[PDB]
Amino acid sequence: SLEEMLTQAVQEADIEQVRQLLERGADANFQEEEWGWSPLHSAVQMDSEDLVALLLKHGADPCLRKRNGATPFIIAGITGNVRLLQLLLPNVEDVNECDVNGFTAFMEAAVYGRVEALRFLYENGADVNMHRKTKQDQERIRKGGATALMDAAEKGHVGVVTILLHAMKAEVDARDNMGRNALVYALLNPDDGKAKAITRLLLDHGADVNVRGEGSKTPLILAVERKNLDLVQMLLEQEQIEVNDTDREGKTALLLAVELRLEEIAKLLCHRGASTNCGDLVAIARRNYDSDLVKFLRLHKAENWKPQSSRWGEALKHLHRIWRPMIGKLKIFIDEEYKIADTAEGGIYLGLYEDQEVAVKRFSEGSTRGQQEVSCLQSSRANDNVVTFYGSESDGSCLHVCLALCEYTLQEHLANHRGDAVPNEEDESARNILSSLFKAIGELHRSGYSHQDLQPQNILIDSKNGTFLADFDKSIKWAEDPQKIKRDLEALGLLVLYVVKKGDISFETLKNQSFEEVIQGSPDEETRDLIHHLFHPGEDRLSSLLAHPFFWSWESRYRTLRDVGNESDIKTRNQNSRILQLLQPSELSTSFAQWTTKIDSFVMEEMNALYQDTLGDLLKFIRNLGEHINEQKNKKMKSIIGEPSQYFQEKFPDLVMYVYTKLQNTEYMKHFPKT
Amino acid sequence: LEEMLTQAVQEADIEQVRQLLERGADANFQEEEWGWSPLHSAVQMDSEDLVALLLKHGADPCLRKRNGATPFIIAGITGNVRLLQLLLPNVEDVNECDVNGFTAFMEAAVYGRVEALRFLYENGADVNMHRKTKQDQERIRKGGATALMDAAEKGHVGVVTILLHAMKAEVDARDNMGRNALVYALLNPDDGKAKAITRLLLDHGADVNVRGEGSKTPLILAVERKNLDLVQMLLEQEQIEVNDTDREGKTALLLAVELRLEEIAKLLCHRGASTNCGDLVAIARRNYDSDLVKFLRLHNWKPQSSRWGEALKHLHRIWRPMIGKLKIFIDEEYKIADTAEGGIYLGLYEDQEVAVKRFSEGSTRGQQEVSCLQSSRANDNVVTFYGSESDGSCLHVCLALCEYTLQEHLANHRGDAVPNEEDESARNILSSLFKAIGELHRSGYSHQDLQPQNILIDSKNGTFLADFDKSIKWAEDPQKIKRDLEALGLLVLYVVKKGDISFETLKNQSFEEVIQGSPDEETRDLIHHLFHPGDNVEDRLSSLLAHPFFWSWESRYRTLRDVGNESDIKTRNQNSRILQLLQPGTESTSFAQWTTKIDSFVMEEMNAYNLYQDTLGDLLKFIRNLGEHINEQKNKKMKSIIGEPSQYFQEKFPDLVMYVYTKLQNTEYMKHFPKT
């Protein structure tokens, strides 16, 4: 706290407290570990001649570097005080000492427009044509290498540029590692006046005008985008300028002028020999409502992008063909032709995000619902079962949310494929859809968000039969109300029935039913138990419910009953054994009590070649039946049973649930199929 | 052709139009794309002759195009007054608006056509009419702007003055967003026109405490524009609330210090702006504004990654300027790895932790990376692509942050599994790579540089593909796909061998050398199929996901059991189909005379009735019979010798799984294979 009380004194500019602590034994070279600012650094920055002299009296190193490698001498280039530079010069080895990015004290006078500081460094040996030497990470991407002339032109300091070109013999056509001269840096100053002045100074000295800057843009191209006829006139005064130069996207200087509705600039470019066959300029000027420019062009007289979606395919071809203004990276047109669905605000339309097909949800930029949607999506990019979030683009008044384009809604999807499966077939599709919903909602909870509006319209299907969660305009962070999760689990239960019933029961119908009514509507015991656990849960239950026998295939259910019936203690009917102790409950009346009286009598006799009405002997009955069903002597028996998995679940619907319940958290859990 | 003759209207040749209108061309012909009739195209180009010539032929001046604007409305844009006169006696309402609510009066304001504006005023046009648009736009509070707002946005000082005085315009009118013309004025890039209109609007009583885009006040827009003149003009109003905050809670003074505007900040303090809305002194200090620093002196984010955790806490804590949506600082503390260009650093992209690969904005490899990523967003096993932000010279590619490289990961978990345990992790890694590379091919891209440094592991042990800086579209060269499958083969061995064999060592080996390095027959066969996928490669990676390499040891044991339970194997019917496929002709394999290679005690006890023959069929019967009875009480002695049966049979006869798989691959008995 002795060194730390001296850094507080320098900021308060109490000169006496500094003298009191420098004689008390405070470190003058003490660098704070965060950014490395020494007391000598902080004094020069705030321009206090007294504190810089007082600390230099106590041996404060003027070569002491900060985190970015800048000495207090270099900082004096920023401050611009000439007598601070005088105080530090006799203790500096090289005046061209640069920080880790290559910034010398000379450059810091140019960047900040410190003329009196710039001149002092000039006569004292500072290099005017010094390129910045930075680290090898920046060098490998052609960064750095700029001079003081470029720095001064970028900042628009007309005073500094004039002195460098005349008094200090600066190279006007010097290049950085990117290949850019000071002319490019000049046209980037938003002030129209300052840019005009520096351009004149640079052109008269011989700066190359056919150079490339940001986006392969020439100075002529930058002048058009700035909408400054004066800057264009100065450039076209050179005859060697290449007017037919193309930028990254292949747009020429003339093309951008017509696009931006600049009558005189477009006229000037044509009169200087710019080619008019680089685009349909007349139609562009026609849609701009520039009658004068349309006529002027009259007197001087391939497609390949293929969309991936099938439903929206032909519509995407049109949206790519037509011209639209870009909202950042998004190409969108608000029309009934490109509408996807209606929402509580703005609706959903087709769009193109970096030439990628996306579905666009629109919000008023002030809407809290828009914020809740974009907040939840950014956290669920790692969620595989949530629609892929591209980004958000603002037009100033409309919040555009671009999402992965899907073919049909879950409600629509179940309808379109309703006629595929015979009515008495294992519904594999229902398990694939519901499981992916468990994964989406489960991982969404671990991400701290709850959907709050789970309905089949909010569940989409892509072209590859994948199911995704979407429409988080009503989502919340469930930390604020921990028990609000129950709504998603309740809606998940209704979705289990909605999907099992292949969509025949409407979701509105399911919302108006009570819990007991919904349970009755389930066709089997596996669905009834699953929905119960969703309405009556106990943080990661949704992952644990993926092992529920609902998601077991009929072979896996058949395989599991076989494997239990192969237990040694069931086959020997060891009443003392653990396995029968678990299967011996208390409970109500099961459908497999006196199970011998409900099976075909022909099968009963051949298998007895001592079955009791216990559960253990039923599974033993399944084990012997399963291993031997295909033997020659059982061909007649095989016709009675048919497919055995369907047979036992048909005669005893509660069998799978009953075995699962008793063996859930036991050693015999190992007989369950792997999940 | 008859209606396509209307192309002459574009050339505005009067002779051909009069000649073809009597030839039978539709004057109201609307092209189906946008609905531009010949009368529409004429008013757009301002042709006095063609409007009269077409009005002679009954051309409807109320005929609407796609956006609902009549040729009369278009005349508001053109500004020719005699076109308005030619159409006025044939228009029901002068305030007829298009589908967005643009009337002929408003179209004169947007384009600054004063002579058109004056004519429409005295003929009944509504000056304070708000735009009535469709309910899609209305439900997001879009539209509703007036002619005063239209003129202020475009900066036409002439039109604003006439509207405020001669035409009784409401100065404090609000749109559906809640914005007045003053907000539309401050958005004009022209400094002069914005200043003039602001004075005209303020003198009439325009509300200055209004909110625009992003809850920005008029004062805030002047500060962000860096225009001292506009700030003084606004602070001349006494009712202005100077301490009003935008959406992000930034006040007028706060934004001024951040942007290094000395005098504006000084002016705001002299007008009563609060100084306790932020650490203003330090902000001016890091801007190197010595005078502004002196002047002011006189007056929970938790990262999810574990490895990079403490570093993300610092990057969120420190202040950095934003490169679009990316917060990044190039420092050794936040370095991840070095690349051929730019290296890899930590960053925050929309407050999310991301790994950033850096390129020069001109680099073609940077373009190939961002090109391949945009196509692989739907690929679950490719690193999640967040977005790309440009700093003007550096292409920043933000990707999902992963913990360790596959090479690093195998080392860190090398000590986990006892050497004689099923390598489950190797199957999870390779399968996800097959899914990643497979779907990448379906997306039309090939990796071309598959190496373990290009395979990442997230926090949840998930494996992802990355480093698409050398990817190509394989349509130009279809057979280059085999290279990715060849590198995939080396990855199969590299992952099975737990990384002990270096990848460079494997790249210098030949095909036959690499195959020899495989420790078992399942790996040996898989690697072969990747080196020889054939010219009909197509979707071979999907078909190889059913290869017994990805079968669990339980699934292999279950399948050999299930085959041994076939009726014709238990009865040893040599004529049957099942045995003909397995045993045709009178054997070279490790299970020939397999009865002589197992412990004699197990061999004898199993013989409890014809004994087991040295045929393959009885081996599967031997596995089935052993499996069903292994846990019986009287077999406790036998159980100890074999141990885990799956491990036993695959070790004594390594080719058993491959031999059964090969013989039953495309048969009815394929059903015994595990489900995929």
Ligand SMILES: O=c1c(O)c(-c2cc(O)c(O)c(O)c2)oc2cc(O)cc(O)c12
């Ligand atoms: O791609 C999408 C999509 O197709 C639909 C959609 C919704 C309906 O209600 C329909 O009837 C319909 O045909 C499609 O909604 C979406 C909602 C999102 O939040 C995000 C999307 O990407 C989609």
Ligand SMILES: O=c1c(O)c(-c2cc(O)c(O)c(O)c2)oc2cc(O)cc(O)c12
């Ligand atoms: O998240 C990433 C990541 O962590 C690494 C990485 C980490 C290491 O620890 C290394 O040693 C290494 O070489 C690379 O690379 C990446 C490469 C990408 O193209 C994209 C990424 O998202 C990552």
